[PDB]
Design a protein around this ligand. Sequence first.
Ligand SMILES: C=C1/C(=C\C=C2/CCC[C@]3(C)[C@@H]([C@H](C)[C@@H]4CC[C@@H](C(C)(C)O)O4)CC[C@@H]23)C[C@@H](O)C[C@@H]1O
Ligand SMILES: C=C1/C(=C\C=C2/CCC[C@]3(C)[C@@H]([C@H](C)[C@@H]4CC[C@@H](C(C)(C)O)O4)CC[C@@H]23)C[C@@H](O)C[C@@H]1O
Lengths: 10, 10, 239, 239
Amino acid sequence: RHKILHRLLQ
Amino acid sequence: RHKILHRLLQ
Amino acid sequence: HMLSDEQMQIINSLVEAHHKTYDDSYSDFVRFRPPVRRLSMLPHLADLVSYSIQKVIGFAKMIPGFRDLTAEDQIALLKSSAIEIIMLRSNQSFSLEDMSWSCGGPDFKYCINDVTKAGHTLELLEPLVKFQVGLKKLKLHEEEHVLLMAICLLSPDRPGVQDHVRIEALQDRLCDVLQAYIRIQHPGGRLLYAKMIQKLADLRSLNEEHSKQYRSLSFQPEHSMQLTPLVLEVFGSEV
Amino acid sequence: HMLSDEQMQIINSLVEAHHKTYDDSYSDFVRFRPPVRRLSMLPHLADLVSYSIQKVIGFAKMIPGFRDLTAEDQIALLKSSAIEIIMLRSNQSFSLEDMSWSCGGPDFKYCINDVTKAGHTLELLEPLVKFQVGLKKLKLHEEEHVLLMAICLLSPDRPGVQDHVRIEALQDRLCDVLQAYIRIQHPGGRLLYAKMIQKLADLRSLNEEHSKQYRSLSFQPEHSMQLTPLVLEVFGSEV
Ligand SMILES: C=C1/C(=C\C=C2/CCC[C@]3(C)[C@@H]([C@H](C)[C@@H]4CC[C@@H](C(C)(C)O)O4)CC[C@@H]23)C[C@@H](O)C[C@@H]1O
Ligand SMILES: C=C1/C(=C\C=C2/CCC[C@]3(C)[C@@H]([C@H](C)[C@@H]4CC[C@@H](C(C)(C)O)O4)CC[C@@H]23)C[C@@H](O)C[C@@H]1O
């Protein structure tokens, strides 16, 4: 997963 | 899924 | 012509259930993330919805016959109807003078521009407020109000429901109690029942506009991280 | 013996990053779900954590060399180290007089019994507060504080990290700047560096106690529905 994580990291 | 849903329904 | 003892037993069950799941003080609204006036209002309205879904679930668990469906069917009806029962029960705080929902104090009064700040466009919200005024003008009794919810929720024309015939049975048995209550106990209500079914049809049209806009919103993680676990689950898709 | 221009360039980057990701006013705490004093404090502390994770992510994106790792490695380091950097950065609000974390006003002062009301048992929280007093007694400079975070975070002995050798390189290169800063710029710090590495070891022991208790908590949906999407993702398991 890590949809939110990956996006916060740009 | 529906972990929360199923549990709220007891 | 008069109502059977079991249709009152039903009416009694449905209003006591609504009174258990509806706080007219709106005193739990202080425990949400506070409103802020992008998408400033999304946190506070996301908790508002998540809270309301918990209330809608408690209400459905008390409709006669609902407990006895299979848990899968209960989930399918809730997932498909959740936003509709919310739009329905929300009429109780809606008010025609302010043309907004005035709960508790004035920090919890949501005009149309508050909901835009939670990421929704006027083509959802104009039919929404019109729904709420049209329904506010029908001036339902408490009994017709809880019935229309119980009926909307127990509708079998939902995606994903299995024991279709049993739900259609229970829905109709509640429609009979409604149509019968209006004839006996509501003067001037010879056009009401059809006006209620028409509100159910508007609820569907709203349901789809909202489901579309939420889709666009839930697929942007800067915004879906503002939602709650429960909201994500009930309005999500992996069933 | 004196520090190279690039180790200052590093020190400068790390403190400006910390100042960007740390609000000494704690003025965003009003936007959390309010504290309430089961598990009354879980909502407010769940937003507190979720907010802090957003801050830790912004800080890591500014450590030199971190941006250039692969996104998978960045995720693995964050998921494994998140609760540790939180325990570290949290020392800045911790205070020895109240033996609690005093942020903003007194509604945002968390003694040990507040965190118990968010579902945690004293065998996590006694080593936690002792960690925080032992580290409060080391009286770190801002420079050693940001370094110890950057170092804890860039540790390669994490579950799931791939380019192990590159992270170990970057971690050591930051340890050299630390050990060098203490020798030059910290009087009385000839035992400090080892005391800092020992705090990293305590962070690991805390990490595991917390990871165990959170597991027990996240597997009960009455409680995990109080968490946020971000928390669930970072402390979750499906990597
Ligand atoms: C939910 C209730 C109340 C108000 C409901 C409102 C007024 C504000 C705007 C709301 C919450 C609508 C909007 C479209 C919600 C807010 C969040 C958004 C999401 C779920 C993010 O798409 O839908 C649905 C019902 C609308 C107040 C009170 O009657 C309790 C009732 O359950
Ligand atoms: C997080 C920060 C601050 C305080 C942190 C604290 C004090 C209260 C208790 C906290 C939040 C701990 C507990 C164990 C948290 C709260 C929620 C719980 C979950 C994640 C539900 O397991 O862990 C971790 C750091 C502890 C305040 C300020 O320094 C900002 C800093 O990022």
